[PDB]
Write a protein that holds these residues in place. Structure first.
Motif, short mmCIF file in Angstrom:
data_model
loop_
_atom_site.label_atom_id
_atom_site.label_comp_id
_atom_site.label_asym_id
_atom_site.label_seq_id
_atom_site.Cartn_x
_atom_site.Cartn_y
_atom_site.Cartn_z
N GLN A 102 0.96 -2.82 -6.63
CA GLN A 102 0.56 -3.46 -7.88
C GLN A 102 -0.69 -4.30 -7.69
O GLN A 102 -1.62 -4.25 -8.51
CB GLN A 102 1.71 -4.33 -8.41
CG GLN A 102 2.97 -3.55 -8.78
CD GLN A 102 3.86 -3.26 -7.59
OE1 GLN A 102 3.97 -4.06 -6.67
NE2 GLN A 102 4.51 -2.10 -7.61
N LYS A 103 -0.74 -5.10 -6.62
CA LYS A 103 -1.90 -5.94 -6.37
C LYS A 103 -3.15 -5.09 -6.16
O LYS A 103 -4.22 -5.42 -6.69
CB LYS A 103 -1.65 -6.83 -5.16
CG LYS A 103 -2.62 -7.99 -5.03
CD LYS A 103 -2.40 -8.76 -3.73
CE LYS A 103 -3.43 -9.86 -3.55
NZ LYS A 103 -3.75 -10.11 -2.12
N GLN A 153 4.16 -9.35 -2.20
CA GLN A 153 3.15 -8.28 -1.97
C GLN A 153 2.33 -8.61 -0.73
O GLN A 153 1.60 -7.75 -0.32
CB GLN A 153 2.22 -8.13 -3.16
CG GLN A 153 2.89 -8.19 -4.52
CD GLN A 153 3.29 -6.83 -5.00
OE1 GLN A 153 3.68 -5.96 -4.23
NE2 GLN A 153 3.19 -6.63 -6.31
N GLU A 172 -5.22 -10.34 7.56
CA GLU A 172 -6.45 -10.08 8.30
C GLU A 172 -6.95 -11.40 8.89
O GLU A 172 -7.01 -12.41 8.19
CB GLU A 172 -7.52 -9.46 7.40
CG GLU A 172 -7.38 -7.96 7.23
CD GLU A 172 -6.22 -7.57 6.34
OE1 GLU A 172 -5.92 -8.32 5.38
OE2 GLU A 172 -5.60 -6.52 6.59
N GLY A 182 0.06 -4.53 -1.45
CA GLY A 182 1.10 -3.87 -2.20
C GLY A 182 0.52 -3.06 -3.34
O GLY A 182 -0.59 -3.32 -3.80
N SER A 213 -3.81 -1.98 2.48
CA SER A 213 -3.68 -3.27 3.14
C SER A 213 -2.91 -4.28 2.30
O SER A 213 -2.85 -5.46 2.67
CB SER A 213 -5.07 -3.83 3.47
OG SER A 213 -5.82 -4.06 2.29
N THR A 271 1.89 -8.11 2.65
CA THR A 271 2.49 -7.28 3.68
C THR A 271 1.73 -7.30 4.99
O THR A 271 2.28 -6.86 6.01
CB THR A 271 2.60 -5.83 3.18
OG1 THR A 271 3.07 -5.82 1.83
CG2 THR A 271 3.55 -5.02 4.05
N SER A 272 0.50 -7.80 5.01
CA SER A 272 -0.27 -7.89 6.23
C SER A 272 -1.33 -8.96 6.06
O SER A 272 -1.69 -9.33 4.93
CB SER A 272 -0.92 -6.55 6.60
OG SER A 272 -1.47 -6.58 7.91
N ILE A 298 -14.82 12.46 4.19
CA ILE A 298 -15.27 12.11 5.53
C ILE A 298 -14.94 10.63 5.74
O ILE A 298 -15.15 9.82 4.84
CB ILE A 298 -16.78 12.38 5.70
CG1 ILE A 298 -17.06 13.88 5.55
CG2 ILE A 298 -17.27 11.92 7.06
CD1 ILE A 298 -17.20 14.34 4.11
#
Lengths: 577, 167, 88
Positions: free
Chosen positions: A46-47, C7, C12, A44, A42, C9-10, A189
């Motif tokens: 590095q983050k 960074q 929520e 990049g 969700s 990119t999306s 799973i």
């Protein structure tokens, strides 16, 4: 427990390398992806890599805040060598923890090597277990989170044996935890985190509740789901909120199982020497039980017998069942929280044991649970009373109670202002000291004597408790110069004279015995006695009807005379009189 | 079924209930020559593995009933005994001590063929129990002296339990 | 900010706008669909995630779920006047 040790440093090596899958693995479409409760896809690379590194350190800090943590994200061989060497040099002879996660590289190899990256992030470089063992010191604990983790343990033991074969031309203090068997794969799973083992080792309650919500028994609980669990109120350290009681109960249950199953020496070695090691091994049992159901089998360096079938686990399932039932009203209607009856019923069972179990049969199973409720203001009195009743059966009971680890708890309750703990603590300490007399030093170093003295000066205290306090004081000062000085500074002589003429005979006897003991091989006490007219009163006991008091008085007089070191004519005159 | 079991891992637990009734019907009414369908079904139940935790109380009785009956052929009896012997390695058999020990002792008499297999299965259980076996030590001994049954494995365990050791 | 920015990119909705997340079965018609002859179509709910196209302006990619049963995709622009387009 003489062999105390500590852990001071932690190194967190993470071979994540987000975004690319190694050649060995083909993944399903949903797949399991959470790492330290973060979705790496969700954000990049590095983050995500930094956030995971920080969350892991926080989770580790939950159990050991006084340590130095150093991270190593997607490293190379030289960086690992530098980090390990620096940590070992700084730590000297303390213990060091190594944590390895290999979810982004190929699986280990039969040759005893594990994979790391290259500076360009374009190849996988092997690293021999031999060099890793070389760079680390003797006292160390290793944690592996990878697919074929068993091979690493096997190779480590092989090279440990080899280092002894080549000496005739380091395992002696090394501990290891592994997540899989040599021929097994980790489960993937979509409903579980992709880092099951570390989550179990570091955040037990969260995964425990999430697992409980996934079982077939949940049908017995109406309207409980994962969303409600996500919003459980409280803190892990507040024993009155809903979320702290569960942690308390978990600790108690795991400790009970560990004490009941293992032999004595291994239990002492693993569960009573170091806090971090104890917490890790306590969570290891939950890890075993949870992972057994997905066709996986953890491993450890000091092997332990299986425990997934112990009866106490059933108790756990009951407690949670009750606690989660109140959640809807608690969260929606602001209703108050109702505390659980776990400890009361455990204490009731312990009480039931005593009525009939005088003989030396199998000991009771609830001793550690009793030891876990002394420092709670609600159950303190009942637990202390039951412990006092238990300790009276005989020396074997005292030995068992000391072995299970009761000493530090009682030594901490002396520093309390409550007026109701006096007789109970007096009884417990008298019974303990009657068997082992080496504790005297520990009583004086932390100025516990004060407590007992404040009880001996009260004339309203019953005579039996005063006699027990006198016996405690007499045992404290015997053949111990520091005790002699400390008790003289408290002016025990005057208090001894005050109550020397009570009707109760044994109190007189023990008061005389302690008075005679205090000034043995100690001139200042003899001077105080001479100045305060002690032996003049002591002469009265020479005609007591009961012979034992007479003998005690004679012993006191003999000790008094013995101290006279041929001093000046005043002491000679007193001795001759 | 065997192939599906080997394919899925721990997730197989979510579908066994749908099939349990059909297994129960087979063991009850089987007209096959020599009851070879039952033998194959036992072979599969051997693989079922660390599942069956919540249903060991449904399957177990029938299997026992198989190796105590005098009318059934020997191969099925041996298959059932070996099935229990294999299942003991992963599951827990502390709540069914009486429900397996009594039929075993009964089967001991009236047949000398199943002797060795019967006591091979027996020794297996005494190892998942330890002290929990003490109650039964005298009774079985009475049958052991009558027919003079000997088994190094079973004998060592008994001594260790009476003395307080285990391997 | 210069180094933090690239960074993202999306997005929520729960960290951005819970108000939209709580929305359900509104009576508002989908934007740019009203016709006085056809039956009306309303927004059933909004998807939880927004995808940010990588550019200098960084426009979003919003998507709505209509009451009819089909998705409607949009481009959400900021720092841009869009009236001359309507007239044209």
């Amino acid at each position: 427990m003489k062999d105390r040790m500590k852990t001071v440093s932690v190194a967190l090596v993470l071979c994540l390398n987000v975004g690319v899958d190694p050649p060995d693995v083909v993944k399903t479409t949903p797949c399991a992806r959470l790492e330290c409760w973060i979705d790496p896809l969700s954000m990049g690379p590095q983050k995500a890599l930094e956030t995971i590194g920080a969350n892991l350190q926080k989770q580790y800090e939950n159990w050991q805040p006084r340590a130095r943590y150093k991270q190593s994200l997607d490293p190379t061989v030289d960086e690992v060598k530098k980090l390990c060497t620096s940590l070992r040099r700084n730590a000297k002879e303390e213990r060091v923890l190594f944590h390895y996660n290999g979810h982004g590289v190929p699986r280990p190899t039969v040759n005893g090597e594990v994979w790391v990256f290259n500076k360009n992030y374009t190849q996988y470089i092997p690293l021999s277990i031999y060099d890793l063992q070389t760079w680390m010191g003797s006292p160390s604990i290793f944690v592996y989170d990878c697919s074929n983790a068993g091979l690493i343990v096997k190779s480590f033991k092989q090279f440990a044996l080899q280092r002894e074969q080549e000496l005739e031309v380091s395992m002696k203090n090394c501990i290891q935890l592994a997540a899989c068997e040599a021929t097994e794969l980790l489960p993937m799973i979509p409903d579980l985190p992709a880092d099951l083992f570390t989550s179990c080792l570091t955040t037990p309650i969260k995964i425990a509740l999430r697992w409980f919500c996934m079982q077939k028994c949940v049908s017995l609980v109406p309207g409980v789901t994962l969303d409600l669990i996500e919003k459980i109120p409280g803190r892990l350290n507040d024993r009155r909120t809903p979320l702290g009681e569960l942690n308390w109960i978990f600790t108690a249950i795991t400790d009970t199982i560990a004490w009941n199953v293992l032999p004595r020496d291994l239990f002492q070695k693993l569960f009573r020497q170091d806090l971090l090691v104890a917490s890790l091994f306590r969570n290891f049992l939950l890890a075993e039980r949870i992972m057994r159901s997905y066709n996986c089998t953890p491993v450890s360096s000091p092997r332990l017998p299986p425990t997934y079938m112990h009866a106490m686990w059933q108790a756990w399932d009951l407690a949670v069942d009750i606690c989660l039932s109140q959640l809807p009203t608690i969260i929606e209607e602001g209703t108050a929280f109702r505390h659980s009856p776990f400890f009361a019923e455990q204490l009731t069972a312990f009480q039931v044991w005593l009525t009939m179990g005088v003989e030396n049969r199998n000991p009771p199973e609830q001793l550690p649970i009793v030891l876990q409720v002394l420092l709670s203001q609600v159950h303190r009195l009942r637990a202390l009373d039951l412990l006092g009743r238990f300790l009276d059966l005989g020396p074997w009971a005292v030995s068992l109670a000391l072995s299970v680890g009761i000493f530090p708890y009682v030594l901490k309750l002396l520093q309390s202002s409550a007026r109701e703990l006096r007789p109970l603590l007096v009884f417990i300490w008298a019974k303990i000291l009657a068997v082992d007399s080496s504790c005297q030093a520990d009583l004086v170093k932390d100025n516990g004597h004060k407590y007992f003295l404040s009880v001996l000066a009260d004339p309203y205290m019953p005579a039996e408790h005063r006699t027990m306090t006198a016996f405690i004081l007499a045992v404290i000062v015997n053949s111990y110069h520091t005790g002699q000085e400390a008790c003289l500074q408290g002016n025990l002589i005057a208090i001894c004279l005050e109550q020397l003429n009570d009707p109760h005979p044994l109190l007189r006897q023990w008061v005389a015995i302690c008075l005679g003991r205090i000034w043995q091989n100690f001139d200042s006490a003899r001077w105080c006695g001479v100045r305060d007219s002690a032996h003049e009163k002591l002469y009265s006991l020479l005609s007591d009807p009961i012979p034992e008091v007479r003998c005690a008085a004679v012993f006191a007089l003999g000790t008094f005379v013995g101290n006279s070191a041929e001093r000046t004519d005043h002491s000679t005159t007193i001795d001759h009189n | 079924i065997e192939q599906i079991v080997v394919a899925l891992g721990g997730e197989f637990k979510l579908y066994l209930p749908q099939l349990i009734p059909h297994m129960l019907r087979v063991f009850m009414h089987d007209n096959s020559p020599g009851r070879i369908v039952s033998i194959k079904l036992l072979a599969a139940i051997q693989l079922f593995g660390a599942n069956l935790d919540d249903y060991l109380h449904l399957l177990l009785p029938p299997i026992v009933k198989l190796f105590d009956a005098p009318e059934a052929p020997l191969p099925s009896r041996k298959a059932a005994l070996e099935t229990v012997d294999r299942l003991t390695e992963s599951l827990d058999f502390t709540d069914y001590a009486s429900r397996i020990i009594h039929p075993i002792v009964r089967t001991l008499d009236q047949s000398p063929e199943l002797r060795s297999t019967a006591m091979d299965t027996l020794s297996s259980l005494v190892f998942q129990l330890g002290k929990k076996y003490q109650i039964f030590i005298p009774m079985v001994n009475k049958v052991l002296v009558r027919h003079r049954i000997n088994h190094q494995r079973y004998d060592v365990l008994i001594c260790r339990i009476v003395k307080g050791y285990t391997l | 900010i210069s180094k933090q920015l690239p960074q993202l990119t999306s997005l929520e909705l729960q960290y951005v706008s819970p108000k939209l997340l709580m929305c359900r079965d509104l009576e508002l018609a989908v934007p740019g669909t009203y016709d006085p002859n056809q039956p009306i179509i309303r927004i059933q709910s909004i998807a939880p995630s927004l995808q940010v196209i990588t550019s200098k302006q960084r426009p979003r990619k919003l998507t709505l779920m209509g009451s009819n049963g089909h998705e409607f995709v949009f481009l959400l622009k900021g720092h841009e006047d869009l009236r001359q387009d309507e007239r044209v």
